[PDB]
Symmetry: D2
Subunit: 327 residues, 4 copies
């Protein structure tokens, strides 16, 4: 029959559910202070777009989001997407680490039904808050049949970005989420969805990563690259038992003599080293003369997520590298 | 003017002086392989723009550029610019940490005479190498009377950027140097300079940072911010006598519970904590509820440079914070 | 008491004063539907930033804004700013042609006091409308002492842009106003203004353009450049008495054999030809082999404004060309 | 044979074949001054990538490229791709109108073999000429198996862009070709191709536009939108037999009272009016209150191309509108 699609709104917190003393206060707010019900009733317009059910998964600032919690989130979403009574899901999340949580599910959700992450740069109590409209757009995207099989998406500021390329580029602006080199999957203007691209990477239903029946993930830390970068930080990470290290290198994953010494100690202890870049965009090309693997176009935050997942399936450097060139 | 300006080209290495086997080889090249006079000979046209004098300062990949060497570089430039027969200086440098070295001199050179950093993204032996034209443009800028009193500049890909805003945004493209929110100071088109902006920040002749006689600088490290970031990294830093820590935080310098724990410790040990952002662009706003100071619009790399210089003359947070809003 | 500045809000119309049936409507609304006092009572917080006075100059969609009206707007603003009891002016305007009106005042307002144009991409009745925050920020900018002598500004989406460089780059998004190559003058984050640049161009008090006493402006049209562009469009413009033709050319003001024949007819008939570009950004360089003058980095819309004003003072091509390189 | 792919390089002219008096001459050169054999011999490295055959289709500046010539270019490419011995085609073209010629073929080439347009912003005789590397990259893309079925591509400055989205955004820089909202299809770094997106639009083999046997195309002109735009330009176009009019309007295709009057006249004369935008990016949404059709995300230059082709199929408004949402 012809009816509204069933959409589940899984809330986890963030500024979209945050609040402040006044409406002119755009900073210094308490993220995750509003229930999913509060948000839904704020935009009753969504009712006209679909049959929505709110579910409070958690209510925290995204900076406190952890791998174990994200792992649980992926499992719950897989549970929901399995039901014939669920057409898609919308996940309210904080903007700070949404690219990390979104990319994790992008790789582990075994369904082509739309999984849409939504966020807000201004608190719900702010003048001209962006949450209401973003939420409304997220629902329209999750309920549209065109949205299936496109991988996990992030909806905000009228844009639809792929979890694989989208990233928070600005610390405090509404238009912070961009994919400089890759663009948006589509845009929402005048309540109409305009799809532009389909990412040419593996994801969701065609991903080899399955975290169902998984308690925890391999430990992976991120080290920065800069003039005078200390060798002792590598020592600290190795000692606390990291399984992998993502290096946010200078330029195209360039390493100083101190970083090179630190990386070899790591390779010696069976620790996998992934060279990425601190620049923000671009491809870190292969270089047989430098230690470790290369992150392709994945930024540090994204690389870590994929490295953690890769280690749950293999230790083979050659296999992990290809993962980074295809996911 | 009838008189050709006197320009000193100070070479330090980089890909602009990089060499590879084939012309099609753009990666895995040997940085700092060619001498300064060899670059000048490769572009004889520069001799028509000014009376150039090449001086080899060093010849290494910029990833290995260290604070003590940058310190000496700044003292050498101050030295030359004091001479009445030197109108401008052009410094060939690697692209990887040029934004760090450039910003340092931007704060320590006590002259209004042009100081121009030039670099290249493709080795000198590559097909369509960008170095030749970048060098020619840099000399033109350094020899132009209009270029005085604009602060330290970085010339590349026909663009003129301020050392305070410019950054390498892409790991491998020729158009990698950009200032998304601040734009360029000017552009060079058709052998003509078009100046567009003047930065509204303190620098050079108006800076309080005097580095005469110094041989070393305060130790400052950078820690990344992400999901599951470890507290032990802060312990390690503190244990190795750092004077300040620059945090490349999630979003607007947001800190996780673990990060906050580590920061409290650092603060107790008298370590200065500067909260910046990993996003790439934007303002990290003040927040009395969170620990440490804020980096204004300075990214991690630039933040570290200003913090090191600030610590050479003060440890009072109120004063350091002010520096970050004015420099 | 020693406090609040005096700001006059001149309303001309625009979507910022536009209204639709429901909040779900962001298109198909009516610009210039709400009164100025209605906009003020809508954002009472503005009254805690300054002593505001509202004035209804007009109420129309900006696509209908005309030279004669912009001329009067300029004259009215000059009278207003001459008073000792007026510290600055905020002008609400539609987004479609605000860059034209804003640049006109940029060249004709003879005062250092702040002139801030503000607009909105969404109608006042829309969910997550941007008008309120935009207006609040415009008033804060106009009332700040640091804002004097920076030229006419356009405030929207937390950004402050110069009328000389800013332009609407996207047809429907909130972050449409950008200056790709020149950046923003500053940004407003967390109720604080962060100035970054000062434009290196003549404007306001250093401008030679005086429109006081003027009642009409020279006719100037814009013709597009593209494959198979018709010569007859030039004949039509000439026949209708245009004094100047702004050419939104292909690439760097390149002309086809048909456009060249057209420009030559124009020149032979006393019409001043200005070659700009349809690309959207950059420098159209001088070319001794092509007819007409070049627009520097002025886009077609801005170039038309300057050419119109230039013609009220001279018809000397040498002088007009110099205007384009300095304003 | 040789196991190397067979690539035909079809030369049409352009700066990539441009020649200037001096090496410092990046402007004021002669587009289409060299032959196809000279280009191939200039960069013999291409012969290591594939067995190349050169063909001088023409040699002109792209500003002079006309529809009748593009028509023949399309027909010629179709017969070349029909052969067993042709794996891909590389077309050298001036940058000024490459987006127009490229989009035309994008819609009319009935093959899935790669069709790659390549150009250069600096003349062949310029210091750091970009042409050599651009060509080398174009040949690599055209010969790669991953490249088929991606639609027509434009390769330049290490980027691979789709003919439907790419556009010349800057008048004189090397990094001028961008697709702000849609990103690039892929990038070439270290002699390796990294594909990012597949466009979600109809093209090539799935296009209903066939130009076999056609010698002429319907006439379509472009009119600009700005304050005080004249109605007489519409009358002029109508009087000269245009079948279509593309309007590069203000904002989201906004029209002034004069533009509307002119548009209504054209419609009553059977002229198809297509409202696009002068802004440079974005969606022109549908609007019942305004006359004519909307261009979706196509800019004026692209819109003209699709409208001409649509008119070779039908004049029905609803069908043409659908073409604009799917191509």
């Amino acid at each position: 029959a012809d009816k509204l699609p069933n959409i589940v709104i899984l809330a986890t917190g963030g500024t979209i559910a945050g609040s402040a003393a006044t409406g002119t206060q755009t900073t210094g707010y308490k993220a995750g202070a509003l229930g999913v019900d509060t948000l839904i009733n704020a935009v009753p317009e969504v009712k006209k777009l679909a049959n929505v059910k709110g579910e409070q998964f958690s209510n925290m600032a995204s900076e406190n989001m952890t791998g174990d919690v994200v792992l649980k989130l992926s499992q719950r979403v897989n549970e929901l997407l399995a039901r014939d009574d669920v057409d898609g899901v919308v996940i309210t999340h904080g903007t700070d680490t949404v690219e990390e949580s979104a990319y994790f599910l992008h790789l582990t959700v075994k369904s082509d039904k739309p999984v849409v992450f939504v966020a807000a740069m201004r608190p719900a109590t702010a003048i001209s808050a962006d949450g209401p409209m973003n939420l409304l757009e997220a629902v329209r995207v999750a309920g549209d049949k065109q949205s299936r099989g496109r991988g996990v998406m992030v909806v905000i500021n009228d844009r639809i970005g792929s979890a694989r390329y989208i990233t928070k580029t600005n610390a405090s602006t509404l238009d912070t989420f961009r994919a400089n080199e890759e663009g948006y999957l589509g845009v929402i203007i005048g309540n109409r969805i305009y799809y532009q691209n389909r990412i040419d990477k593996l994801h969701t239903t065609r991903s080899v990563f399955d975290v169902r029946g998984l308690t925890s993930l391999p430990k992976v830390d991120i080290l920065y690259g800069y003039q005078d970068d200390p060798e002792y930080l590598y020592d600290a990470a190795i000692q606390h038992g990291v399984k992998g290290i993502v290096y946010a290198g200078m330029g195209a994953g360039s390493v100083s003599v101190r970083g090179i010494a630190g990386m070899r100690k790591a390779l010696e202890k069976g620790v996998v080293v992934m060279r990425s870049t601190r620049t923000g965009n671009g491809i870190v090309p292969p270089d047989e003369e430098l230690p470790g693997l290369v992150s392709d176009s994945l930024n540090p935050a994204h690389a870590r997520i994929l490295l953690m997942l890769a280690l749950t399936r293999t230790s083979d450097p050659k296999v992990i590298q290809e993962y980074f060139h295809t996911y």
